[PDB]
From a paper:
The overall architecture of OCT1 in our cryo-EM structures resembles the classical MFS transmembrane arrangement of pseudo-symmetric 6 + 6 transmembrane helical (TM) bundles corresponding to the N-terminal (TMs 1–6) and C-terminal (TMs 7–12) lobes.
Our cryo-EM map of OCT1-apo in the inward-open state defines the entire ECD, whereas this region was only partially resolved in the previous outward-open OCT3 and OCT1CS/OCT2CS structures, suggesting that the inward-open state restricts the flexibility of this domain. Simulations of OCT1-apo revealed that residues V37, I365 and L366, which sit in the center of the hydrophobic gate, were within 3 Å of any solvent molecule for only 8.2%, 23.4% and 23.6% of the combined 1500 ns (n = 3 × 500 ns) of simulation time, respectively, suggesting these residues of the predicted hydrophobic gate were tightly packed, preventing extracellular solvent penetration between the N- and C- bundles. We did also observe weak cryo-EM density in the binding site of OCT1-apo at low thresholds (σ < 9). Although we were unable to determine the identity of this material, we hypothesize this may be a buffer component or an endogenous cationic ligand, or the average of multiple different chemical species, consistent with the well-established ability of OCT1 to bind a variety of ligands. Upon examination of E386 and D474, both residues were engaged in salt-bridge interactions with R439 and K214, respectively, as well as an ordered hydrogen-bonding network with surrounding residues.
Numbering used by the authors: 19 to 279, 331 to 515
Write the structure that this text describes.
Amino acid sequence: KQAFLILCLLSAAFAPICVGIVFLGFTPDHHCQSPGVAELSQRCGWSPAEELNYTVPGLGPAGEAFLGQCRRYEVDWNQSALSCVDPLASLATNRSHLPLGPCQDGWVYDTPGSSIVTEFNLVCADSWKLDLFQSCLNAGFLFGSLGVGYFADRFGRKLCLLGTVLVNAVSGVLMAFSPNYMSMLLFRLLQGLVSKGNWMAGYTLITEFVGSGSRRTVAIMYQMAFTVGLVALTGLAYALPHWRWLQLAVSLPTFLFLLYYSPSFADLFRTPRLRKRTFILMYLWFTDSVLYQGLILHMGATSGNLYLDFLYSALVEIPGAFIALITIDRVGRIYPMAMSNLLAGAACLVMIFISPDLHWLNIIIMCVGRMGITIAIQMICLVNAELYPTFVRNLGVMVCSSLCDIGGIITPFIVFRLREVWQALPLILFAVLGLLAAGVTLLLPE
């Protein structure tokens, strides 16, 4: 089936675009660079962990790593007479009396590889600019969803798809050669504009060519090709430790695909029943998008062994798919989706209380939440279709699914900023959103 495998290749290659930020933008441990410190450390012979104890401001109470990460002692390390046992001890009764300055010379990053964070110095006061890398992508998705389908209706469908695939490949390759952060953000926007349109076009063609007897099965194979793409990403991110190398490796396969070759907006709100259904479907699409992206970003930000945690988290999407497929036939849709929302809400709630050393439990609860949101996302793709009649379904699917893009725009600032107010607070949001999405589902008909 030559035509099937190539669209499954087009579905697999989408996953690195959505989730690759986990590997391209990791933050290692850092502290200010200081002159003379290296020379003194060589003369006195400090070991690598001892140099910190003598040189970098301590954590103190409540962690407060800020004083080590973003400040330095204004001490004349060129002084020859300093004690090789503890050089600061002569200067004041307590190190807290010393003057602090900012990292005027730069940061020292403890990593053998590299990331956009380490190259553009997206730390301390600039640390909010990492959130804009994912927000620009989701904004591009939002504009693409409204524009590209109309362009494909005005222009020829085949030439349109061929053009947007050539533009997606070329923009993905050029981003690896980005000379600065601005250009990288413009390539990330131009890639966002086309990626999701291509993915939806391929899905449309695959379910249109295939008959109604197998549409659900080919849809589930299309979603499983995304999981295969995630496992390939996981393996390449392991063998290629540099971000530009991984961006090239991820981009080049797309060139091989090229080488192989009336409704009206007012209707959705005109009646209170259709309004109710529309607002509920909008809310569930929003909630599930926010939770799916939020849990992956939280795991990337917080896991201590990201490679195996990402591998085990990805594989669990296979039983989730088979369970959804069987449940659709045996049971229904309202109660299975309520239960799968409630399960992810409860897993997010329990994760607040787990002791940080119970990692072997923490991964189990993370996998249970992942499987829950996977089953719920699979269910809503069916429920969203039959609640709208065919006269409006082509529009109504676009309308309700667009909330996924505003959720993706908002999510990065929640995970990265709000965590600095209090580290539990994002999980409290995810718990409340999931436990409200559980109850609201029961108000839909069946």
